Amino acid sequence: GDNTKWNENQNPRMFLAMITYITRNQPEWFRNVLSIAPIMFSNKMARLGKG
Amino acid sequence: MERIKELRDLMSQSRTREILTKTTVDHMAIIKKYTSGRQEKNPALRMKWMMAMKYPITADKRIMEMIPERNEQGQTLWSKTNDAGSDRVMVSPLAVTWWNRNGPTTSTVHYPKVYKTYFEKVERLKHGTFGPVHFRNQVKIRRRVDINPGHADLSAKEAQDVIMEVVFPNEVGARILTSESQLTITKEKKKELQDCKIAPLMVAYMLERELVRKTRFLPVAGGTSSVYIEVLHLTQGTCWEQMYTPGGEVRNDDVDQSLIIAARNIVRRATVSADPLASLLEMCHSTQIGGVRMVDILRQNPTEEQAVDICKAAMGLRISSSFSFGGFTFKRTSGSSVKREEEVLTGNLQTLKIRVHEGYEEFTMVGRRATAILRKATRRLIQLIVSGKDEQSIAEAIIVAMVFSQEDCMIKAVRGDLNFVNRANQRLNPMHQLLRHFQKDAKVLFQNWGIEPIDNVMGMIGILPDMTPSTEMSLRGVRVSKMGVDEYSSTERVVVSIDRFLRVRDQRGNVLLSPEEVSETQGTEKLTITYSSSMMWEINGPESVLVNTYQWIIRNWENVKIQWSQDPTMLYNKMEFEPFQSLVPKAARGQYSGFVRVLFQQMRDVLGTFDTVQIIKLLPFAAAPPEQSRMQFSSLTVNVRGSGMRIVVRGNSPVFNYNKATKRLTVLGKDAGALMEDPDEGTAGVESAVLRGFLILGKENKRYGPALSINELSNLAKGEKANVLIGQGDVVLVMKR
Amino acid sequence: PKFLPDLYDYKENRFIEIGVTRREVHIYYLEKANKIKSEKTHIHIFSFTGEEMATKADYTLDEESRARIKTRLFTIRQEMASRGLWDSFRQSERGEETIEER
RNA sequence: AGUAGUAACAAGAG
RNA sequence: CCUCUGAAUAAACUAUU
RNA sequence: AUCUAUAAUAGUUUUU
Ligand SMILES: *O[C@H]1[C@@H](O)[C@H](n2cnc3c(N)ncnc32)O[C@@H]1COP(=O)(O)OP(=O)(O)OP(=O)(O)OC[C@H]1O[C@@H](n2c[n+](C)c3c(=O)[nH]c(N)nc32)[C@H](O)[C@@H]1O
Numbered sequence: 004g005d006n007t008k009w010n011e012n013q014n015p016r017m018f019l020a021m022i023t024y025i026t027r028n029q030p031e032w033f034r035n036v037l038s039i040a041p042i043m044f045s046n047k048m049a050r051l052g053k054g
Numbered sequence: 055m056e057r058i059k060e061l062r063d064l065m066s067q068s069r070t071r072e073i074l075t076k077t078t079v080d081h082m083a084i085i086k087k088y089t090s091g092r093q094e095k096n097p098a099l100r101m102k103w104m105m106a107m108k109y110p111i112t113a114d115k116r117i118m119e120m121i122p123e124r125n126e127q128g129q130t131l132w133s134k135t136n137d138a139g140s141d142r143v144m145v146s147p148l149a150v151t152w153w154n155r156n157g158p159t160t161s162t163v164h165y166p167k168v169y170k171t172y173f174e175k176v177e178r179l180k181h182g183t184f185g186p187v188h189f190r191n192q193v194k195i196r197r198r199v200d201i202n203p204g205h206a207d208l209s210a211k212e213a214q215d216v217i218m219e220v221v222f223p224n225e226v227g228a229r230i231l232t233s234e235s236q237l238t239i240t241k242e243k244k245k246e247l248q249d250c251k252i253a254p255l256m257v258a259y260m261l262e263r264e265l266v267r268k269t270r271f272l273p274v275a276g277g278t279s280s281v282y283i284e285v286l287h288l289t290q291g292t293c294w295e296q297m298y299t300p301g302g303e304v305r306n307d308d309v310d311q312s313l314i315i316a317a318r319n320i321v322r323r324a325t326v327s328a329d330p331l332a333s334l335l336e337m338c339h340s341t342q343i344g345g346v347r348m349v350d351i352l353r354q355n356p357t358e359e360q361a362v363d364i365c366k367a368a369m370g371l372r373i374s375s376s377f378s379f380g381g382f383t384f385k386r387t388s389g390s391s392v393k394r395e396e397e398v399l400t401g402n403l404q405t406l407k408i409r410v411h412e413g414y415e416e417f418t419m420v421g422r423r424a425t426a427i428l429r430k431a432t433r434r435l436i437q438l439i440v441s442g443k444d445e446q447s448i449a450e451a452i453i454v455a456m457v458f459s460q461e462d463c464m465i466k467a468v469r470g471d472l473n474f475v476n477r478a479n480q481r482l483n484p485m486h487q488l489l490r491h492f493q494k495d496a497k498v499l500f501q502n503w504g505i506e507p508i509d510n511v512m513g514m515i516g517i518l519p520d521m522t523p524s525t526e527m528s529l530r531g532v533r534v535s536k537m538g539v540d541e542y543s544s545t546e547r548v549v550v551s552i553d554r555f556l557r558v559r560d561q562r563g564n565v566l567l568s569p570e571e572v573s574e575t576q577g578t579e580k581l582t583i584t585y586s587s588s589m590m591w592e593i594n595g596p597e598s599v600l601v602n603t604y605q606w607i608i609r610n611w612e613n614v615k616i617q618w619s620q621d622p623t624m625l626y627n628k629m630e631f632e633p634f635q636s637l638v639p640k641a642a643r644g645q646y647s648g649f650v651r652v653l654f655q656q657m658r659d660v661l662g663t664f665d666t667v668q669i670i671k672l673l674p675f676a677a678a679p680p681e682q683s684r685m686q687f688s689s690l691t692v693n694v695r696g697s698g699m700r701i702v703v704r705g706n707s708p709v710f711n712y713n714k715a716t717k718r719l720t721v722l723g724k725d726a727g728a729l730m731e732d733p734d735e736g737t738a739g740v741e742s743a744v745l746r747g748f749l750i751l752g753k754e755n756k757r758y759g760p761a762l763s764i765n766e767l768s769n770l771a772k773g774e775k776a777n778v779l780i781g782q783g784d785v786v787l788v789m790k791r
Numbered sequence: 792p793k794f795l796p797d798l799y800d801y802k803e804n805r806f807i808e809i810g811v812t813r814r815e816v817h818i819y820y821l822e823k824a825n826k827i828k829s830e831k832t833h834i835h836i837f838s839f840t841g842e843e844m845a846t847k848a849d850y851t852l853d854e855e856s857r858a859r860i861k862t863r864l865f866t867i868r869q870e871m872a873s874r875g876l877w878d879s880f881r882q883s884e885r886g887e888e889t890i891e892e893r
Numbered sequence: 894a895g896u897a898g899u900a901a902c903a904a905g906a907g
Numbered sequence: 908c909c910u911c912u913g914a915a916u917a918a919a920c921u922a923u924u
Numbered sequence: 925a926u927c928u929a930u931a932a933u934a935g936u937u938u939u940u
């Protein structure tokens with residue numbers, strides 16, 4: 004099998020949820036440093052290119 | 055003095071001072087990679103483009119003072135234009151080839167020492183011996199092998215620490231070489247490198263090439279030793295094997311491992327023979343390990359292993375009834391046991407099988423720095439007496455004895471992320487994994503083992519889970535003494551008698567070893583093993599045995615078919631099926647035999663139903679003494695690398711699959727050949743070699759009601775037709791003879 | 792040494808471990824001896840109350856410099872007590888050599 | 894013109 | 908006219924050192 | 925019997 008447009012349908016928010024579930028019962032600093040990445044990726048911008 | 059003057063000069067300037075002041079040691083690494091950019095994306099295209107230029111090479115300015123600007127014919131060798139982002143100049147390959155023919159000559163006598171490994175490769179190739187080339191059916195297996203042997207008892211981090219200590223004594227940070235091997239190697243290399251005159255960095259790289267061990271996953275056949283893996287491209291092919299022996303010196307541990315593997319294979323294949331002793335003798339006399347006859351090694355090699363001892367006893371040599379475990383030499387003084395596969399649940403919620411030995415037994419353990427006497431029962435440590443040198447030795451002996459006892463307390467003490475499979479999903483030995491886990495830290499093991507008051511007898515000291523010498527209570531069943539050694543008698547090879555069925559007995563008459571005590575593990579050899587006989591696959595691994603058995607049946611299908619039709623009694627007794635019979639589970643062999651034979655009889659009673667594939671598939675299973683029964687088998691198992699792989703009676707299977715479009719047989723993914731069609735084949739869609747007392751008539755017939763399972767066919771009578779769910783999701787109408 | 796010592800003495804040719812204790816000296820000395828697990832490293836412990844301890848009751852320096860250290864410790868303690876900062880500074884010694892990631 | 898193919902080259906810059 | 912220049916995505920793995 | 929040490933370079937795999 005192949006999955007059509009895998010990366011255009013996966014959402015950063017679901018990765019945030021998965022990380023939150025994985026890091027349960029862990030120190031808060033670890034959870035924050037892991038959670039920053041999905042937070043930054045759900046507010047990302049795209050450069051258009053040369054023109 | 056030069057360093058400090060240059061530092062002062064740099065600090066005088068502004069940009070250099072700012073760089074040196076604002077930059078930490080950590081950021082020195084970042085600025086070291088700092089660059090404007092290496093705009094190279096196609097190195098091959100760029101090289102082809104550049105080689106057409108006049109001056110593609112870069113050289114230091116010293117070249118202007120050492121090589122003339124032009125050669126005899128006036129061709130320019132270099133120019134004064136600098137390379138952007140540096141001060142080096144541009145030069146032509148003509149300069150390189152002019153230097154190679156007219157440059158000053160030096161003394162390159164120490165290069166073989168700096169690059170000793172490659173010249174050692176050259177020497178090994180030079181003195182190697184080439185044998186014949188054999189065309190066969192190669193079965194390469196993907197395994198981890200070693201490409202850089204390095205040092206025997208060292209790892210990557212330890213080797214790097216040793217290199218740092220030897221070459222950079224003041225840069226070792228906080229590391230201290232605690233292992234005895236590391237200290238000994240460091241002293242030896244410092245003695246060797248005493249008063250060395252080679253640059254420290256190159257000495258570090260030399261020591262890296264000499265000491266660091268490197269391993270990789272490769273598809274290998276034959277030996278997995280470093281010397282045999284460097285020439286793997288030459289010795290093994292897709293259809294051929296080249297006999298070759300490296301010309302260097304062979305390590306003793308590799309010889310021991312190869313001998314153990316060969317002895318285990320030989321004994322396992324000999325047990326299934328009608329006269330095991332003669333078969334074992336001839337197999338030993340027809341086997342070589344790394345170009346050396348096996349008998350010579352058996353004479354001059356002191357290895358403690360069951361199969362090796364059986365081989366020695368067959369050859370009339372004195373043996374030792376000892377084996378190895380956890381680095382200790384165990385020797386059963388009394389008692390007996392039987393192996394049994396028992397499923398257990400690990401402390402960290404893992405389910406695994408273990409080979410539990412039942413019965414009561416007494417052993418004596420001898421170690422390089424410890425000694426003990428052990429008495430145990432089935433998964434129960436009756437008592438242990440340890441007389442080690444210091445606390446560490448006694449702790450190690452205690453851990454080894456605890457793991458050896460197969461105690462449930464030991465199993466439940468497993469914690470953390472301990473895995474019982476390889477990174478490639480290959481099974482690992484549970485006992486070795488437990489030993490490695492508990493040797494790192496046994497605090498939980500000791501805490502959960504238990505405590506018990508002691509009787510204070512003979513002055514033997516106690517021991518607590520904290521590893522301290524108590525006198526009131528100690529670890530359950532464990533005692534610490536000082537006068538227990540009895541080490542000389544360990545190396546006391548005794549004269550023994552070997553029975554026809556490979557039962558080693560003492561002079562008194564007590565049984566010491568038997569084939570049942572040999573390990574069932576199917577390992578691989580460090581040195582290549584060569585077997586000379588009609589069947590060069592007689593003592594090979596399971597996959598090779600299977601593929602070659604079916605290939606032999608296919609190749610000789612004419613006379614085999616005639617013999618099966620006429621005189622089946624002699625066909626089942628072929629010597630070719632015995633290696634296959636070794637793979638079948640013992641307790642099942644007879645049963646399977648019976649089953650298969652009955653099918654063949656029916657296949658002869660009912661004419662017009664002659665499927666070649668069925669006979670070829672089931673023939674190897676009829677080589678054992680039959681045991682009559684009424685059981686119905688839908689598949690027959692074979693032990694491959696510790697897993698029970700099934701062969702389905704009807705239809706294709708993962709192991710044995712036949713393709714009608716190409717008329718080709720595949721065994722474990724290897725092509726065993728193409729069957730040749732016979733005019734006598736029954737082209738009527740009727741199968742008479744699937745069920746023990748039933749004949750498959752056709753596809754599903756809804757008249758006779760819903761289908762029923764295979765095991766529920768015992769209720770039928772003569773002439774009754776019924777639908778059966780025999781096969782992979784297939785329902786067929788059958789009748790009972 | 793197994794751990795970084797504070798000073799090295801060439802005259803005695805030995806590593807010296809220095810400690811400043813806000814509690815009683817003996818408990819701190821026992822803690823340091825347990826941690827380092829050595830007998831070749833000279834240990835010298837001071838306190839803000841003027842107390843002192845050392846290995847084998849050996850004091851490498853003369854009494855003048857020891858008195859100078861004692862008066863410096865007393866002066867700093869007095870300064871801290873004037874501002875009322877001494878109570879926590881004494882109560883925070885136990886949780887001092889620990890890393891709390893933030 | 895030609896290469897080529899979802900956008901470019903068929904010299905660019907100072 | 909003259910001077911210079913011919914173009915380096917992420918992750919994992921493989922090989923060599 | 926186990927076997928993921930680091931860093932450099934190149935090659936391969938990962939489309940509505
Ligand atoms: O490389 C493999 C093997 O070739 C190598 N090896 C074995 N022997 C030597 C010697 N003598 N020198 C150098 N190298 C040697 O070590 C590797 C072993 O591989 P593997 O086949 O997986 O191990 P094995 O199958 O032999 O089982 P193992 O756990 O090592 O047990 C060794 C030995 O101890 C017997 N044994 C275990 N237990 C719990 C026993 C018991 O309770 N009662 C009795 N009587 N025996 C017990 C094992 O069955 C083996 O006999």
Ligand SMILES: [Mg+2]
Nearest residue numbers: 004005006007
């Ligand atoms: Mg796919």
Ligand SMILES: [Mg+2]
Nearest residue numbers: 795796797809
């Ligand atoms: Mg300190």
